[PDB]
Design goal:
The structure is a homodimer. By secondary structure, the first copy, chain A, is α/β, with parallel strands linked by helices. In chain A, helix 7 crosses helix 13 and helix 10 crosses helix 11. Chain A has two domains: about 260 residues, Peroxisomal Thiolase, Chain A, domain 1; about 140 residues, 3-Layer(aba) Sandwich (Peroxisomal Thiolase, Chain A, domain 1). The first copy, chain A, is about 35% helix and about 20% strand. In chain A, strand 13 and strand 14 form a beta hairpin. In chain A, the strands form three sheets. A ten-stranded mixed sheet of chain A has the order 5-4-6-7-1-8-14-13-9-10, sandwiched between helices. Chains A and B meet through helix 4, helix 5, helix 6, strand 5 and helix 7 of A and helix 4, helix 5, helix 6, strand 5 and helix 7 of B. Bound molecules: (3R,7E,10E)-3-hydroxy-4-oxododeca-7,10-dienamide (2 copies), chloride ion (CL) and sodium ion (3 copies). The site of one sodium ion (NA) has 4 residues of chain A, from loops. The PDB classes it as transferase. The entry lists the keywords kasii, ketoacyl synthase, condensing enzyme, fatty acid elongation, cerulenin, drug target, transferase. The assembly is dimeric. The entry is titled "Crystal structure of Bacillus subtilis beta-ketoacyl-ACP synthase II (FabF) in a covalent complex with cerulenin".
Chain lengths: ~425, ~425
């Protein structure tokens, strides 16, 4: 018995990010080096050492659905549904009864409905268990983003949700890519979503000192900079439509590019500390390269994990050098987190969009805020300004707590 | 040039913690003897909830399996996953050396992860302030920490993931790990589901949803397919299996319980909690798994059903079996082990995959206990009360979850 190996193309993009309430706004702001970082308004910033966050700007859920529908969705689900409908509309895909069992959904979330859980548990403690919402359980579960997307779209195919901390979006896309490659779906609506700007998330990330305590939004998120002191938390959703090539061509779909490689490894080291020298991340990049059937020298641009944390940025630099050798100083590396902040489970989704758009548009987005170069972080980070360049291959990296490492490789579409 | 043959995937090890026993042998032997793991709730004070019964682990002490130093930073869901995964690897007699470590992966899911940790830590936040929240709060709570902690405990450096799909969690995680090995991305996968849902918010949440049985009698509370079924009885635990590429298993002289041959996944695209009318989505997922296995539906001998003891789910699952199997539906055996273990949520698929694999190896079908009033709408052969000795070639395991997830696995008797 032999494996089916279908070609998988990107036919639609949808997004909500601190840089815009659609792909066009997000992409244009990213290539112009616009920061989505400002003072915290979502929660009371006085209680936490962290004073800045990357929030959605002027997002009103009622512009997309009824108040009654929105009331039964946590922010993480609202973002996923809005971005998925945006991606399908962009793909110009008509999900009929005929194709519905061949159209699936694979969207992840790092934590799901944390705000709902906090509000509902606070109701339990002060008002008693009978006052708990009949919809608390489905609203909270991370897989409800996939569930609500499938209902909104009429998508009846492969239906799943990957939860792998900050590697969530990258793994979800990789998993959906594998579904199409083996012929188990013709279309997959995939990516990540996150609404982590909550009391427990700010308390939790302050307790483990992962968050930047820099009160200046102009210098808070500075990946690879000598003075980096933790990440700046963001929110949103990045959803893409993956499609089997012949299916896309037959319907006259527009093609942004092709997904060719996916790598997944575990550090098997520590619950929160990444492996020394980023060895696991190096292995995940190598698996994705082997999956794509290319030489490492073929990678033109790396959309780095680059969170603006001491260890991660240093280890990611080391991992790139291990994988690419002499080609490491020849490629371009950039972290869009310098502008969007860290979207956690949605990071991989938004960064896959930027990686795909980098190939289609031939523009590398920059890493902003690098003022003090770090001798340990000496690669080409495309500082301050976007670079116009024809790209053939783009690599996107992610990692998460529990030692998860995930890598995706995108390729310029050629017939 | 690239490789293209599908690898054959065998089950080489089993590990479990369930309300029926703190290992596979105890759980299996109690299940085949129709022993109930359901009793009054002791985990939380149940006086405020309408639900009065649960299926808890019996005399489980995490310190019998690991040092206190290791257990302290683990929520119960992670403790269960680590203990069951170590048991599965020990049973598989697998030596994870530095050489094979990048070829040994982990794919374990949890429906909710560290809910108890989240509740305790949020209660600390409200009464003591955010500066008193633990630096271990975030990693302890996240559902993927079961995979994370299992990989650290084992030294497993390969494909590392976590599927979260409500009650379909365990089934999807196993199916996903099976696909990893089939495409040649790992030689070994430690996979399954884990859950510790016996918490304040879980009892309150499922009571508010009216998903839980409010029957105070532990003797009749969980009764799948019975006319008087009135919601599920919550359980806890972990079911972990070692999946392995066939040639790798044969070369090391591994014992083989059976083979994984089929996996189906669909979405109802209907409602947040209610399953589709006539269980159409579940019927499609069974059909996808059957096609994946390359068999005729008549080849299925036994169905380990989702059978949660809820009105719509048991009725719709019965309808879905009739749609898929036709005239063969009344010829096959169907049973719900949830009648004994209760509903393990994210761990249900893991424990039920173990029972399905053991059903083939031992040639014994576990029964559905507590069926006293037959429902005219649920008229299939549910193997009532007593286990059935039968040679099985193919076993199908079904799962479904909130959000319209449907997941199916097919296991086969191993033949060279
Ligand atoms: C992420 O892995 C951080 C990193 N190393 O880049 C991470 O911790 C995300 C975990 C998901 C968190 C959602 C919020 C929880 C309170
Ligand atoms: C499960 O899907 C119910 C079913 N239809 O069988 C389910 O609700 C589990 C989702 C929750 C998992 C753990 C959450 C506890 C609060
Ligand atoms: Cl934990
Ligand atoms: Na997570
Ligand atoms: Na065991
Ligand atoms: Na529990």
């Amino acid at each position: 018995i032999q494996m089916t190996k279908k070609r998988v193309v990107v036919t639609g993009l949808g997004a909500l990010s601190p840089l815009g309430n659609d792909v066009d706004t997000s992409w244009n702001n990213a290539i112009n080096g616009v920061s989505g970082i400002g003072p915290i308004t979502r929660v009371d910033a006085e209680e936490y050492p962290a004073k800045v966050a990357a929030e959605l700007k002027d997002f009103n859920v009622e512009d997309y659905m009824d108040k009654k529908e929105a009331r039964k969705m946590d922010r993480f689900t609202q973002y996923a549904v809005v971005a998925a409908k945006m991606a399908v509309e962009d793909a110009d895909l008509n999900i009929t009864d005929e194709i519905a069992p061949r159209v699936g959904v694979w969207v992840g979330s790092g934590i799901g409905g944390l705000e709902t859980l906090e509000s509902q548990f606070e109701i339990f403690l002060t008002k008693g268990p009978r006052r708990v919402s009949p919809f608390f359980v489905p609203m909270m579960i991370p897989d409800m983003a996939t569930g609500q997307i499938s209902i909104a779209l009429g998508a009846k195919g492969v239906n799943s949700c990957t939860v792998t901390a900050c590697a969530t979006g990258t793994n979800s896309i990789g998993d959906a890519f594998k579904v199409i490659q083996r012929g188990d779906a013709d279309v997959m609506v995939t990516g990540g979503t996150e609404a982590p700007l909550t009391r427990m998330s700010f308390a939790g990330f302050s307790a483990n000192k992962a968050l930047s305590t820099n009160p200046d939004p102009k210098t808070a998120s500075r990946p690879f900079d000598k003075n980096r002191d933790g990440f700046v938390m963001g929110e949103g959703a990045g959803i893409i439509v993956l499609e089997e090539l012949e299916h896309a061509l037959a319907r006259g779909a527009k093609i942004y590019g092709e997904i060719v490689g996916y790598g997944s490894t575990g550090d098997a080291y520590h619950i929160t500390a990444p492996a020394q020298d980023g060895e696991g991340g190096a292995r995940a990049m190598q698996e994705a390269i082997k999956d794509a059937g290319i030489a490492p020298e073929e990678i033109d641009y790396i959309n780095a994990h680059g969170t603006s944390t001491y260890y991660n940025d240093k280890y990611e630099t080391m991992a790139i050098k291990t994988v690419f050798g002499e080609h490491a100083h020849k490629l371009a590396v950039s972290s869009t987190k310098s502008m969007t902040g860290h979207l956690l489970g949605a990071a991989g989704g938004i960064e896959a969009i930027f990686s795909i758009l980098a190939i289609k548009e031939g523009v590398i987005p920059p890493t902003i805020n690098i003022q003090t170069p770090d001798e340990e972080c000496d690669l080409d980070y495309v500082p301050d300004e976007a670079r116009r360049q024809e790209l053939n291959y783009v690599l996107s990296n992610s990692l998460g707590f529990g030692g998860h490492n995930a890598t995706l490789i995108f390729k310029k579409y050629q017939s």
